[PDB]
């Protein structure tokens, strides 16, 4: 057990191992890690065991962060608690590499820049999807980027109704079947988000900036066309089916006339991502082999994940049982090389 030291930073008490120095608020603090030599981000969880829902959410986040080991995905450098026993356990601290900016802060992007940024998102997604994990909240503010154009996916979907209401970026990247609760969704919702991000890097403009759910759906159907009978059968809500059928039918637009001047290979890839029927969208593994990425694709350096057991999600436990499982995962952590 390392030696811990205490300090109050902006009305927050922080008790951390001596290895972490020069803490600065950014609750989250930046620090220097004397063991690895990295600048790090330290997150102190707020009230992690205040309800059954919150205790389970804390366990879910720690299980996910402990699993992810990939160059294009956030990973765990350390996790600790100052507690010496389960009985006094109450605080959880998480540590990762400090990232300086997100995709917004960076975004004159050339076509070569778009190729490299989207390639890295897809490489990370192939890894995440191989473990049967769905991100669900891909958007520019959840992508960290450095000076060398290297990128990481973070802030997995572990959102409220007020959060998704009106003219908000929280909704502009969401697949339509999840925005309107059309059906049980799967990992293909993440490919829709990648298409929206790619379009915005190419044009400089948000692709579907709707003023509400309905205005956004109208923008989407104008580009990709109204649904046919095949997809309509897959919408489980009779209510949503009736609404869709009230709209005048529209053909799919010509993407070469929408994305004027873009690389034709980028136009082709966007057509394969932005498909209304989620069963027919290109997968992450398929997209990495697309000719747009010929300068970067290496099938021997695009790894998959170890399997990920999510059976706890269907389990009903008390607060202290979720808390004891979390304590076990804290003390069993083994750091990366
Ligand atoms: C928007 O993203 C954030 O605010 C996270 C906070 C965060 C810290 C540690 C862990 Br482990 C998980 C998350 C962040 C990650 C890296 N660099 C800065 C901040
Ligand atoms: Cl230490
Ligand atoms: Cl504690
Ligand atoms: Cl965003
Ligand atoms: Cl057109
Ligand atoms: Cl799995
Ligand atoms: Cl597992």
Short mmCIF file of C-alpha atoms and ligand atoms in Angstrom, two decimals:
data_model
loop_
_atom_site.label_atom_id
_atom_site.label_comp_id
_atom_site.label_asym_id
_atom_site.label_seq_id
_atom_site.Cartn_x
_atom_site.Cartn_y
_atom_site.Cartn_z
CA UNK A 1 0.00 0.00 0.00
CA UNK A 2 1.41 3.39 -1.02
CA UNK A 3 1.56 6.40 1.26
CA UNK A 4 -1.33 8.83 0.70
CA UNK A 5 -1.42 12.60 1.24
CA UNK A 6 -4.37 15.00 1.60
CA UNK A 7 -5.16 18.41 0.16
CA UNK A 8 -8.20 20.61 -0.41
CA UNK A 9 -8.55 21.92 -3.98
CA UNK A 10 -11.47 24.29 -4.69
CA UNK A 11 -13.54 22.95 -1.77
CA UNK A 12 -12.69 19.34 -2.72
CA UNK A 13 -10.69 17.01 -0.48
CA UNK A 14 -8.26 14.84 -2.47
CA UNK A 15 -6.38 11.97 -0.82
CA UNK A 16 -3.99 10.38 -3.35
CA UNK A 17 -0.72 8.38 -3.47
CA UNK A 18 2.56 10.33 -3.30
CA UNK A 19 3.36 9.29 -6.88
CA UNK A 20 0.83 11.91 -8.11
CA UNK A 21 2.15 15.51 -7.87
CA UNK A 22 1.24 19.09 -8.82
CA UNK A 23 -2.53 18.54 -8.88
CA UNK A 24 -4.51 21.28 -10.69
CA UNK A 25 -8.32 21.44 -11.06
CA UNK A 26 -9.50 21.11 -14.66
CA UNK A 27 -14.29 16.45 -10.14
CA UNK A 28 -11.18 16.16 -12.35
CA UNK A 29 -7.57 17.28 -11.77
CA UNK A 30 -4.46 17.26 -13.94
CA UNK A 31 -1.27 15.88 -12.37
CA UNK A 32 2.22 14.52 -13.04
CA UNK A 33 2.72 10.79 -12.43
CA UNK A 34 6.26 10.20 -11.13
CA UNK A 35 6.08 6.44 -11.74
CA UNK A 36 5.22 6.49 -15.48
CA UNK A 37 6.39 10.01 -16.40
CA UNK A 38 3.00 10.84 -17.98
CA UNK A 39 0.83 13.85 -17.43
CA UNK A 40 -2.44 12.31 -16.21
CA UNK A 41 -6.10 13.11 -15.59
CA UNK A 42 -7.45 12.00 -12.17
CA UNK A 43 -11.24 11.78 -11.72
CA UNK A 44 -12.76 11.55 -8.22
CA UNK A 45 -16.23 10.01 -8.32
CA UNK A 46 -19.07 11.97 -6.72
CA UNK A 47 -21.31 9.99 -4.33
CA UNK A 48 -20.63 6.66 -6.06
CA UNK A 49 -22.90 4.51 -3.80
CA UNK A 50 -25.83 6.85 -3.01
CA UNK A 51 -28.51 4.62 -4.59
CA UNK A 52 -28.83 1.22 -6.25
CA UNK A 53 -28.80 2.96 -9.65
CA UNK A 54 -25.66 4.93 -8.78
CA UNK A 55 -23.81 1.98 -7.21
CA UNK A 56 -24.49 -0.13 -10.33
CA UNK A 57 -23.41 2.74 -12.59
CA UNK A 58 -20.11 3.00 -10.70
CA UNK A 59 -19.51 -0.75 -11.12
CA UNK A 60 -20.38 -0.54 -14.85
CA UNK A 61 -17.90 2.29 -15.49
CA UNK A 62 -15.04 0.56 -13.66
CA UNK A 63 -15.68 -2.77 -15.45
CA UNK A 64 -15.62 -1.05 -18.86
CA UNK A 65 -12.49 1.06 -18.23
CA UNK A 66 -10.63 -2.01 -16.88
CA UNK A 67 -11.41 -3.94 -20.08
CA UNK A 68 -10.30 -1.42 -22.75
CA UNK A 69 -6.70 -1.93 -23.97
CA UNK A 70 -6.33 -0.27 -27.41
CA UNK A 71 -4.34 2.67 -28.81
CA UNK A 72 -7.52 4.47 -30.04
CA UNK A 73 -9.65 3.98 -26.88
CA UNK A 74 -9.39 5.46 -23.37
CA UNK A 75 -7.60 3.09 -20.99
CA UNK A 76 -6.98 2.85 -17.25
CA UNK A 77 -3.52 3.67 -15.88
CA UNK A 78 -4.59 3.28 -12.22
CA UNK A 79 -7.57 3.05 -9.86
CA UNK A 80 -7.32 3.58 -6.10
CA UNK A 81 -9.13 4.28 -2.80
CA UNK A 82 -7.58 5.59 0.44
CA UNK A 83 -9.74 3.07 2.37
CA UNK A 84 -7.96 0.21 4.12
CA UNK A 85 -11.05 -2.03 4.45
CA UNK A 86 -14.41 -2.65 2.82
CA UNK A 87 -16.16 -1.17 5.89
CA UNK A 88 -14.63 2.30 5.42
CA UNK A 89 -14.72 2.19 1.60
CA UNK A 90 -16.47 5.23 0.13
CA UNK A 91 -14.34 7.01 -2.49
CA UNK A 92 -13.12 5.91 -5.93
CA UNK A 93 -10.41 7.64 -8.02
CA UNK A 94 -9.67 6.85 -11.72
CA UNK A 95 -6.48 7.75 -13.67
CA UNK A 96 -5.76 8.02 -17.42
CA UNK A 97 -3.40 9.87 -19.79
CA UNK A 98 -4.09 13.60 -19.94
CA UNK A 99 -5.52 14.68 -23.29
CA UNK A 100 -5.19 18.28 -24.39
CA UNK A 101 -8.11 18.87 -26.74
CA UNK A 102 -11.14 17.34 -28.42
CA UNK A 103 -12.09 17.18 -32.08
CA UNK A 104 -13.99 20.51 -31.85
CA UNK A 105 -10.92 22.39 -30.60
CA UNK A 106 -9.00 21.20 -33.66
CA UNK A 107 -11.95 21.59 -36.07
CA UNK A 108 -8.34 23.93 -42.43
CA UNK A 109 -8.59 20.13 -42.69
CA UNK A 110 -7.31 18.48 -45.85
CA UNK A 111 -8.65 15.22 -47.25
CA UNK A 112 -5.52 13.53 -45.85
CA UNK A 113 -6.51 14.72 -42.37
CA UNK A 114 -10.07 13.35 -42.72
CA UNK A 115 -8.70 9.99 -43.89
CA UNK A 116 -6.44 9.65 -40.85
CA UNK A 117 -8.98 10.85 -38.25
CA UNK A 118 -11.85 8.62 -39.46
CA UNK A 119 -9.48 5.64 -39.89
CA UNK A 120 -8.56 5.86 -36.19
CA UNK A 121 -12.22 6.10 -35.07
CA UNK A 122 -13.04 2.98 -37.13
CA UNK A 123 -9.98 1.08 -35.81
CA UNK A 124 -11.09 1.75 -32.23
CA UNK A 125 -14.69 0.82 -33.09
CA UNK A 126 -13.68 -2.52 -34.62
CA UNK A 127 -12.07 -3.30 -31.24
CA UNK A 128 -15.04 -2.10 -29.14
CA UNK A 129 -17.61 -3.92 -31.29
CA UNK A 130 -15.64 -7.19 -31.22
CA UNK A 131 -16.35 -7.35 -27.47
CA UNK A 132 -20.10 -6.74 -28.06
CA UNK A 133 -19.87 -3.25 -26.54
CA UNK A 134 -21.89 -0.35 -28.02
CA UNK A 135 -20.61 3.20 -27.43
CA UNK A 136 -23.99 4.93 -28.18
CA UNK A 137 -22.73 8.54 -27.79
CA UNK A 138 -20.06 9.16 -30.44
CA UNK A 139 -19.75 12.90 -31.19
CA UNK A 140 -16.84 15.36 -31.63
CA UNK A 141 -16.71 16.31 -27.92
CA UNK A 142 -16.10 12.62 -27.05
CA UNK A 143 -13.00 12.28 -29.29
CA UNK A 144 -9.61 13.40 -27.94
CA UNK A 145 -6.97 14.55 -30.47
CA UNK A 146 -3.32 15.64 -30.08
CA UNK A 147 -0.86 17.78 -32.07
CA UNK A 148 0.20 14.77 -34.20
CA UNK A 149 -3.46 14.10 -35.22
CA UNK A 150 -3.64 10.99 -32.98
CA UNK A 151 -7.12 10.22 -31.65
CA UNK A 152 -8.85 8.35 -28.80
CA UNK A 153 -12.51 7.47 -28.15
CA UNK A 154 -13.72 8.31 -24.64
CA UNK A 155 -16.85 8.95 -22.54
CA UNK A 156 -18.79 5.79 -23.34
CA UNK A 157 -22.56 5.87 -23.00
CA UNK A 158 -23.19 4.50 -19.52
CA UNK A 159 -28.68 10.90 -20.90
CA UNK A 160 -31.93 12.52 -19.76
CA UNK A 161 -34.96 13.67 -21.75
CA UNK A 162 -34.28 17.36 -21.11
CA UNK A 163 -30.70 16.81 -22.31
CA UNK A 164 -31.89 15.71 -25.78
CA UNK A 165 -34.52 18.45 -26.27
CA UNK A 166 -34.33 21.27 -28.82
CA UNK A 167 -31.38 22.68 -30.81
CA UNK A 168 -28.67 20.57 -29.14
CA UNK A 169 -25.52 18.74 -30.30
CA UNK A 170 -26.36 15.99 -27.78
CA UNK A 171 -28.89 14.67 -30.40
CA UNK A 172 -27.46 15.67 -33.83
CA UNK A 173 -25.23 12.56 -34.14
CA UNK A 174 -27.82 9.98 -32.97
CA UNK A 175 -29.16 7.28 -35.29
CA UNK A 176 -32.87 7.79 -36.07
CA UNK A 177 -33.97 4.39 -34.70
CA UNK A 178 -32.61 5.30 -31.23
CA UNK A 179 -33.61 8.99 -31.35
CA UNK A 180 -37.28 7.96 -31.75
CA UNK A 181 -37.22 4.54 -30.00
CA UNK A 182 -38.22 2.69 -33.20
CA UNK A 183 -36.76 -0.69 -32.25
CA UNK A 184 -34.17 -2.59 -30.28
CA UNK A 185 -30.89 -1.11 -31.51
CA UNK A 186 -27.45 -2.66 -31.85
CA UNK A 187 -23.86 -1.69 -32.64
CA UNK A 188 -24.80 -0.23 -36.06
CA UNK A 189 -25.98 2.97 -34.30
CA UNK A 190 -22.28 3.87 -33.89
CA UNK A 191 -21.64 3.70 -37.66
CA UNK A 192 -24.41 6.27 -38.24
CA UNK A 193 -22.59 8.61 -35.83
CA UNK A 194 -19.28 8.13 -37.68
CA UNK A 195 -21.00 9.15 -40.95
CA UNK A 196 -22.29 12.36 -39.35
CA UNK A 197 -18.79 13.18 -37.99
CA UNK A 198 -17.09 12.45 -41.34
CA UNK A 199 -19.54 14.69 -43.27
CA UNK A 200 -18.86 17.56 -40.83
CA UNK A 201 -15.06 17.25 -41.16
CA UNK A 202 -15.45 17.41 -44.97
CA UNK A 203 -17.88 20.38 -45.14
CA UNK A 204 -17.27 22.35 -41.95
CA UNK A 205 -21.03 22.19 -41.16
CA UNK A 206 -23.22 20.02 -38.91
CA UNK A 207 -24.97 17.44 -41.10
CA UNK A 208 -28.38 17.21 -39.32
CA UNK A 209 -28.68 20.28 -36.98
CA UNK A 210 -32.34 19.79 -36.09
CA UNK A 211 -34.24 22.26 -33.89
CA UNK A 212 -36.11 19.29 -32.26
CA UNK A 213 -36.58 15.51 -32.81
CA UNK A 214 -39.12 15.99 -35.65
CA UNK A 215 -37.23 18.71 -37.53
CA UNK A 216 -34.14 16.46 -37.32
CA UNK A 217 -36.04 13.47 -38.74
CA UNK A 218 -37.21 15.61 -41.68
CA UNK A 219 -33.60 16.64 -42.43
CA UNK A 220 -32.50 12.97 -42.33
CA UNK A 221 -35.28 11.68 -44.63
CA UNK A 222 -34.64 14.46 -47.18
CA UNK A 223 -31.08 13.14 -47.65
CA UNK A 224 -31.53 9.36 -47.38
CA UNK A 225 -35.16 9.00 -48.55
CA UNK A 226 -38.34 7.86 -46.78
CA UNK A 227 -38.60 4.23 -45.58
CA UNK A 228 -39.81 1.38 -47.74
CA UNK A 229 -42.09 -1.46 -46.66
CA UNK A 230 -39.13 -3.65 -45.65
CA UNK A 231 -37.90 -1.24 -42.96
CA UNK A 232 -41.42 -0.21 -41.91
CA UNK A 233 -42.09 -3.82 -40.83
CA UNK A 234 -39.12 -3.60 -38.45
CA UNK A 235 -40.48 -0.59 -36.51
CA UNK A 236 -42.16 -2.14 -33.46
CA UNK A 237 -44.13 0.93 -32.38
CA UNK A 238 -47.43 1.03 -34.26
CA UNK A 239 -47.50 4.71 -33.28
CA UNK A 240 -44.19 5.59 -34.96
CA UNK A 241 -45.19 3.49 -38.00
CA UNK A 242 -48.37 5.55 -38.43
CA UNK A 243 -46.42 8.82 -38.16
CA UNK A 244 -43.84 7.78 -40.79
CA UNK A 245 -46.65 6.78 -43.16
CA UNK A 246 -48.16 10.27 -42.86
CA UNK A 247 -45.11 11.85 -44.58
CA UNK A 248 -44.96 12.37 -48.35
CA UNK A 249 -42.51 9.96 -49.95
CA UNK A 250 -39.02 11.20 -50.94
CA UNK A 251 -36.21 9.55 -52.96
CA UNK A 252 -32.62 9.32 -51.77
CA UNK A 253 -30.56 12.33 -52.92
CA UNK A 254 -27.39 12.26 -55.05
CA UNK A 255 -24.53 12.50 -52.51
CA UNK A 256 -22.09 13.79 -55.17
CA UNK A 257 -24.33 16.88 -55.50
CA UNK A 258 -24.57 17.28 -51.71
CA UNK A 259 -20.85 16.90 -50.88
CA UNK A 260 -19.64 18.99 -53.81
CA UNK A 261 -15.96 18.60 -54.63
CA UNK A 262 -15.23 15.86 -52.09
CA UNK A 263 -13.03 12.87 -52.88
CA UNK A 264 -15.32 10.41 -54.74
CA UNK A 265 -14.11 7.60 -52.49
CA UNK A 266 -15.25 9.59 -49.44
CA UNK A 267 -18.65 10.14 -51.09
CA UNK A 268 -18.93 6.38 -51.69
CA UNK A 269 -18.11 5.56 -48.05
CA UNK A 270 -20.68 8.08 -46.73
CA UNK A 271 -23.37 6.42 -48.86
CA UNK A 272 -22.54 3.10 -47.19
CA UNK A 273 -22.61 4.48 -43.62
CA UNK A 274 -25.69 6.73 -43.84
CA UNK A 275 -28.26 4.02 -44.64
CA UNK A 276 -31.65 4.32 -42.95
CA UNK A 277 -32.11 0.53 -42.40
CA UNK A 278 -29.52 -0.33 -39.76
CA UNK A 279 -29.27 -3.97 -40.99
CA UNK A 280 -27.70 -2.69 -44.24
CA UNK A 281 -25.05 -0.27 -42.93
CA UNK A 282 -21.36 -1.06 -43.48
CA UNK A 283 -19.64 -2.52 -40.38
CA UNK A 284 -16.43 -1.12 -38.86
CA UNK A 285 -14.35 -4.12 -40.01
CA UNK A 286 -15.74 -3.80 -43.55
CA UNK A 287 -15.10 -0.02 -43.68
CA UNK A 288 -11.42 -0.38 -42.70
CA UNK A 289 -10.95 -2.34 -45.96
CA UNK A 290 -12.57 0.44 -48.07
CA UNK A 291 -10.34 2.07 -50.72
CA UNK A 292 -10.62 5.49 -49.02
CA UNK A 293 -8.19 4.21 -46.32
CA UNK A 294 -5.64 2.54 -48.64
CA UNK A 295 -2.81 4.73 -47.29
CA UNK A 296 -3.37 3.55 -43.67
CA UNK A 297 -5.09 0.13 -43.66
CA UNK A 298 -2.99 -2.73 -42.25
CA UNK A 299 -4.96 -5.92 -41.50
CA UNK A 300 -2.12 -7.20 -39.28
CA UNK A 301 -2.34 -4.11 -37.03
CA UNK A 302 -6.11 -3.76 -36.46
CA UNK A 303 -6.64 -5.83 -33.31
CA UNK A 304 -9.78 -7.27 -31.72
CA UNK A 305 -10.71 -7.44 -28.02
CA UNK A 306 -10.83 -10.18 -25.41
CA UNK A 307 -14.44 -11.24 -24.67
CA UNK A 308 -16.43 -9.05 -22.24
CA UNK A 309 -18.95 -10.62 -19.81
CA UNK A 310 -21.91 -8.25 -19.30
CA UNK A 311 -24.16 -10.71 -17.45
CA UNK A 312 -24.21 -8.34 -14.44
CA UNK A 313 -26.48 -5.96 -16.40
CA UNK A 314 -29.46 -8.28 -15.89
CA UNK A 315 -28.66 -8.88 -12.18
CA UNK A 316 -30.68 -7.41 -9.28
CA UNK A 317 -28.51 -6.62 -6.23
CA UNK A 318 -28.61 -4.41 -3.15
CA UNK A 319 -26.44 -1.30 -2.72
CA UNK A 320 -23.88 -3.01 -0.50
CA UNK A 321 -23.59 -5.95 -2.92
CA UNK A 322 -22.80 -3.60 -5.83
CA UNK A 323 -20.37 -1.77 -3.51
CA UNK A 324 -18.58 -4.99 -2.54
CA UNK A 325 -18.20 -5.98 -6.20
CA UNK A 326 -16.72 -2.55 -6.92
CA UNK A 327 -14.24 -2.87 -4.03
CA UNK A 328 -13.11 -6.26 -5.38
CA UNK A 329 -12.41 -4.74 -8.82
CA UNK A 330 -10.45 -1.85 -7.26
CA UNK A 331 -8.10 -4.07 -5.25
CA UNK A 332 -7.61 -6.61 -8.09
CA UNK A 333 -6.40 -4.00 -10.64
CA UNK A 334 -3.10 -4.84 -12.35
CA UNK A 335 -1.47 -1.90 -14.16
CA UNK A 336 -0.32 -1.98 -17.79
CA UNK A 337 3.39 -2.63 -18.60
C1 LIG B 1 -13.98 14.96 -21.58
O1 LIG B 1 -13.23 13.91 -21.00
C2 LIG B 1 -12.81 14.09 -19.72
O2 LIG B 1 -13.09 15.12 -19.14
C3 LIG B 1 -12.02 12.93 -19.14
C4 LIG B 1 -12.23 12.74 -17.62
C5 LIG B 1 -11.69 11.41 -17.16
C6 LIG B 1 -10.53 11.33 -16.38
C7 LIG B 1 -10.03 10.07 -16.01
C8 LIG B 1 -10.71 8.95 -16.46
BR1 LIG B 1 -9.96 7.18 -16.17
C9 LIG B 1 -11.87 9.01 -17.21
C10 LIG B 1 -12.36 10.25 -17.56
C11 LIG B 1 -10.58 13.23 -19.48
C12 LIG B 1 -9.74 12.23 -19.99
C13 LIG B 1 -8.44 12.57 -20.35
N1 LIG B 1 -7.93 13.82 -20.25
C14 LIG B 1 -8.74 14.77 -19.75
C15 LIG B 1 -10.07 14.52 -19.35
CL1 LIG B 2 3.08 6.39 -4.27
CL1 LIG B 3 -12.57 5.80 1.06
CL1 LIG B 4 -20.04 17.50 -29.85
CL1 LIG B 5 -29.64 15.28 -55.38
CL1 LIG B 6 -17.98 -10.79 -26.03
CL1 LIG B 7 -15.22 -10.18 -18.86
#
